Enzyme design. Structure first.
Site, short mmCIF file in Angstrom:
data_model
loop_
_atom_site.label_atom_id
_atom_site.label_comp_id
_atom_site.label_asym_id
_atom_site.label_seq_id
_atom_site.Cartn_x
_atom_site.Cartn_y
_atom_site.Cartn_z
N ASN A 10 -52.15 31.32 17.64
CA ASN A 10 -53.46 30.91 18.14
C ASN A 10 -53.91 31.88 19.24
OD1 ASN A 10 -55.78 29.51 18.84
ND2 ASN A 10 -54.71 27.87 19.96
N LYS A 12 -56.85 31.83 20.56
CA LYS A 12 -57.80 31.09 21.39
C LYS A 12 -59.09 31.91 21.55
CE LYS A 12 -54.06 28.48 23.58
NZ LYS A 12 -53.51 28.02 24.88
N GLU A 96 -56.90 21.38 23.32
CA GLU A 96 -58.06 21.92 24.02
C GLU A 96 -59.38 21.36 23.48
OE1 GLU A 96 -57.06 26.13 23.71
OE2 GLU A 96 -55.32 25.67 24.96
N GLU A 164 -47.74 19.63 20.42
CA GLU A 164 -48.14 20.28 21.66
C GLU A 164 -47.70 19.39 22.81
OE1 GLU A 164 -52.40 21.15 20.46
OE2 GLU A 164 -52.25 22.33 22.34
N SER A 210 -45.12 26.29 25.16
CA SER A 210 -45.00 27.68 25.60
C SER A 210 -43.89 28.36 24.81
CB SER A 210 -44.71 27.77 27.10
OG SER A 210 -45.65 28.62 27.74
#
Lengths: 247, 247
Positions: A10, A12, A96, A164, A210
């Site tokens: 990703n 982003k 997000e 996540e 992470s």
């Protein structure tokens, strides 16, 4: 029998043609493990560009889409458009979009159903927040989110779940490989009882916390972690090491 | 001294490379007026493609963007990316972003500030809903929305106001040319007293209601209507007639 390792990157909201051009050229020339299914999540504006430049073996994903093919939804794109530029995946339900843009479990579920019906693959994302994890309702939250996805999945062969640990994003808290394994194991056990035994055994549950080149070998060695959804490190050359996390 | 006629064409979530290719080919070969500034609002996944195919005389606009250049905002694009593919505009505060996706006046103001600072032009959209028009508080609503934008505008030369009578979108009511002139006139008066007289005389306030080839001549002949933000008709070849509304 074994689930194929799956590393999605990703990107982003990051990069331009020059920087993403250099990123792609590095992945194209890198020694990647044939065991790993690699997919790059590009910004909408660079989806066509990313597909042209990336090798056919590395897949391309949209970072988000809407729930119908066309209509009066200024700013949005549909699975029909993502298919039209040559991409085969879409990331839905990212933390997000849930947090910053208020996307509900109902809305995500509608997007999942539509994306799948139009022939795209889906990387569906779930995860509990800080106050939820501290309250000890991790299972109640991720099962709620997984159910909102699963009610809209008829065929699991084109779906990948992404956990996540949002509770460890931006707060003082951190996730250990043991904590990731415990959630992934419970998600697989949920699929076993609410969908089927075969779906639980074939569905890739990837870790979306992470993930760096320094921590990916330990996270990948976990029984029920079948790969990653990589954030910031997917922009760096160490994304190659993360693809090769089992070798 | 006169304000240049401005016709923007909001494609919304519609089309593919083939259908948008035929759309663009028709506009490129059409006899478009030199007195009209034409801008095409393409979906994000086709912004690059649209800029390449469209002739230089026709501008290109994103349908939406976010408030920073980069960051952890999956599914969003920034002005820096829109600038990178050769587009010079962005549509912000569209009624559909406000209603369907709950975009607030604050977020829109933040987006406008960032878009202008990064060098883009902005078609900022405002408009009152059915219940607001019915209550008679039209002035109060569009002055509030315009203020949230104006507080974040340092230079108005790259800004275009688009009035959207949302009360006439799917409700069965329609806005007359007199009613459009009535709002546009009050918006220009708002700019006169809250910013400057020079800003009010030079800022294009375009009509974002239902614009076709049948009704554009009478709307454009109104004194404070300086062009259009066209919805459905921007996909079809009659968009050429709307561009040539004054001739």
């Amino acid at each position: 029998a074994p689930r194929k390792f799956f590393v999605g990157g990703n990107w982003k909201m990051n990069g331009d043609k020059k920087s993403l051009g250099e990123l792609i050229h590095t992945l194209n020339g890198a020694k990647l493990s044939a065991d790993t299914e690699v997919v790059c999540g590009a910004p909408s504006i660079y989806l066509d560009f990313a597909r042209q430049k990336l090798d056919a073996k590395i897949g391309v994903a949209a970072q988000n889409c809407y729930k119908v093919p066309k209509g009066a939804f200024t700013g949005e794109i549909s699975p029909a458009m993502i298919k039209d530029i040559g991409a085969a995946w879409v990331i839905l339900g990212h933390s997000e979009r849930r947090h910053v843009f208020g996307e509900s479990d109902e809305l995500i579920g509608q997007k999942v159903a539509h994306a799948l019906a139009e022939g795209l693959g889906v990387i569906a994302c779930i995860g509990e927040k800080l106050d939820e994890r501290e309250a000890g309702i991790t299972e109640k939250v991720v099962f709620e989110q997984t159910k909102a996805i699963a009610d809209n999945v008829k065929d699991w062969s084109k779906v990948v779940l992404a956990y996540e640990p949002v509770w460890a994003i931006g707060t003082g808290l951190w996730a250990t490989p043991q904590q990731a394994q415990e959630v992934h194991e419970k998600l697989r056990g949920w699929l076993k009882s609410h969908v089927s035994d075969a779906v639980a055994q074939s569905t890739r549950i990837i870790y979306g916390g992470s993930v760096t080149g320094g921590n990916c070998k330990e996270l990948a060695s976990q029984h029920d972690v079948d790969g990653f959804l990589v954030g910031g490190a997917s922009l760096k050359p160490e994304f190659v090491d993360i693809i090769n996390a089992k070798h």
